């Protein structure tokens, strides 16, 4: 039986992978541009929320 926890944990990893993918994409743009990136700006908070 998948209760609220395991069901929620199923969503979180998909949504956390998107978060980690998103910061990778955001950072790659700035790193290629030659300028360091701001971590706070790289994170898209709406992905998990």
């Amino acid at each position: 039986l998948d209760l609220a926890g395991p069901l929620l944990a199923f969503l979180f990893r998909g949504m956390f992978k998107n978060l980690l993918k998103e910061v990778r994409i955001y950072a790659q743009k700035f790193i290629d541009r030659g300028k360091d990136f701001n971590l706070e700006l790289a994170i898209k908070t709406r992905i998990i929320s």
Partner: protein, 222 residues
Amino acid sequence: AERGELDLTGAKQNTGVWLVKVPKYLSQQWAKASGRGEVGKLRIAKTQGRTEVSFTLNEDLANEHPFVLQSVGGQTLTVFTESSSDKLSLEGIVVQRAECRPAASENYMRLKRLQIEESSKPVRLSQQLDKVVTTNYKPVANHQYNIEYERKKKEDGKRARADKQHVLDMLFSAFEKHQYYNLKDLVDITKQPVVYLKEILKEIGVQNVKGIHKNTWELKPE
């Protein structure tokens, strides 16, 4: 006789060794000092038709370990060592297998529980936070990355347009290194404005359509 040769002398002598399985706490106590040359005494008692093996922990080490033998006919085991000087040798062949068990049953689990709890220290758990965090996106006059990159660009300053002759000489000199160059890569080597560089390249050079990646400039005018 070579580096990869194995010193199989131990096998020739048919030396016998015993394989023993012991818990971590017994070895952990040994690992505590591990240099005193003594950790206990192994006592073996034999009767008319029965043999028993037991081990006693050193009194200093503490501040009964009965042994159970196992059949070795189902699998053949050998012991070998690799010397730091790249000289492998065979210590011997295992002739008996034994296991160590705890004399105590009730309070022994207490030590195991501590180990399980101790190994649980790296197990990180989410922490409830009384007050919402207010230090994020906190006021900054400028992001540090922005000032660093802007300062670098200002210092590096301007791409001067060198006299056509100097630019031409650099282009021809670099042509020897490789047959073809990319426009973006060529700009870095020449360090000239893209529009100015393109005009100079157009005056002599031409671009050839390549079916492998794309149409790229060729430094050869013809």
